């Protein structure tokens, strides 16, 4: 049935957005602990820029969820139902036991429109999104810049490493390569002056 097809697509999206908020807030929790344990003026300014990015991932993902759930609920059951945790209804709809479907399909197409502007689904994934943002790069370079000589490259290494040990405590080959990739994309700006 066409409703059982869209119900499966709606539930897959709802489960994916729920995991987005879980990953992002888990990053925020380790960052706020990492910010409180250490007393440095510099690295704390990085956590400020990073926290502002991670919290806004959560606000965006919850905004998409609360908009999609009533939309999915109306389609699955045409009879008036606009409540949260519709997970049970579409799940059983997806298995067993048109206007609103059109309404739903568009919102799913609308949702993916913002698929590019979506932080990770895991803690490693959100971390990668954090370092890719200009806001974090702009904050990081301002801290390492010196008025006279060239910006300090060794400090930029140390600050990014401390941030990466705030979010992902256990280092991996991927975390190391991710740290190197982000620092490399900044090489043009750490040679100015």
């Amino acid at each position: 049935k066409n409703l059982a097809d869209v119900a499966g697509i709606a539930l897959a999206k709802i489960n994916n957005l729920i995991k987005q908020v879980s990953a992002a807030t888990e990053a925020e929790a380790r960052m706020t602990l990492a910010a409180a344990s250490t007393d440095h003026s510099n690295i704390s300014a990085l956590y400020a820029a990073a926290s502002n990015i991670v919290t806004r991932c959560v606000l965006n993902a919850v905004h998409a969820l609360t908009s999609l759930a009533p939309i999915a609920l109306t389609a699955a059951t045409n009879g008036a139902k606009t409540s949260g945790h519709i997970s049970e209804v579409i799940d059983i709809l997806q298995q067993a036991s048109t206007v609103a479907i059109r309404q739903l399909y568009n919102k799913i197409g609308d949702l993916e429109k913002q698929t590019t502007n979506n932080c990770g689904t895991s803690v490693t994934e959100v971390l990668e999104h954090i370092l890719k943002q200009e806001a974090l790069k702009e904050a990081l370079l301002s801290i390492v810049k010196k008025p006279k000589g060239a910006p300090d490259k060794t400090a930029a290494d140390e600050l990014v490493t401390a941030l990466i040990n705030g979010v992902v405590p256990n280092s991996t080959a991927q975390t190391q390569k991710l740290k190197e990739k982000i620092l490399n994309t900044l090489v043009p700006k750490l040679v100015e002056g």
Partner: antibody, heavy 121, light 112 residues
């Protein structure tokens, strides 16, 4: 200013081993990633690998043509870079260049003159 | 496992004119808008010299006659105006995915 020289090249028998070295001066060796690159006579440049600095764990990356046979190491006390070659084959004959990395496994901004290795019986 | 294809393999340009060398990647060597493509010059018997890093950044000490552009899979190196000292082979290199790879090289001949 920045100076890297290569040394240790020579004639090697097939299957034999050879260690080439790179003495550097004019910059803080410890702060930089270092690469090895080779060029067979009349052929294109070929990246062999790099070694990370002290801050990033002294670990290495290698191309597959050389993985398992060659080992890159460094001596931060003397600001010298090494490449240890084992189980050499005839097509490993090339000029071997030591090159300083501009970033963290990025582009190579300073190169040595190179040292020549010939593998032949 | 990124393959680098340079075109043309050989190029002859008159003094004062423009030389354009192109590198085509088998897959993207970019990371969002940031490029991991670099250009080197090698005169015969000499070590390579880095000209351009990250597609378009001119390395310090290199004259403004060199410039680079491109994104994703297609990049070009530009020499304007060409001089006698430009007689050399030029290589692209990508550091986007391990292992780093080089192009096959382009030999530039200066007409006289």
């Amino acid at each position: 200013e920045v100076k890297l020289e290569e040394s240790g090249g020579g004639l090697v028998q097939p299957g034999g081993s050879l260690r080439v070295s790179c003495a550097t001066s004019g910059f803080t060796f410890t702060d930089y990633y270092m690469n090895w690159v080779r060029q067979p006579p009349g052929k294109a440049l070929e990246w062999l690998g790099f070694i990370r600095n002290k801050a990033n764990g002294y670990t290495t990356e290698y191309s597959a043509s050389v993985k398992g046979r060659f080992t890159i190491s460094r001596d931060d006390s003397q600001s010298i870079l090494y490449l240890q070659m084992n189980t050499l084959r005839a097509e490993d004959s090339a000029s071997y260049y030591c090159a300083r990395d501009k970033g963290w496994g990025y582009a190579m901004d300073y190169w040595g003159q190179g040292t020549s290795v010939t593998v032949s019986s | 496992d990124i393959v680098m294809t340079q075109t043309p393999p050989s190029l002859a340009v008159s003094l004062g004119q423009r030389a354009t060398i192109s590198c085509k990647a088998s897959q993207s060597v970019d990371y969002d808008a940031d490029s991991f493509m670099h250009w080197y010059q090698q005169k015969p018997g000499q070590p390579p010299k880095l000209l351009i890093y990250a597609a378009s950044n001119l390395e310090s000490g290199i004259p403004a006659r060199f410039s680079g552009s491109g994104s994703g899979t297609d990049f070009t190196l530009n020499i304007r105006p060409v001089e006698e000292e430009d007689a050399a082979t030029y290589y692209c290199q990508q550091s986007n995915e391990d292992p780093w790879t080089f192009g096959g090289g382009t030999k530039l001949e200066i007409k006289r």
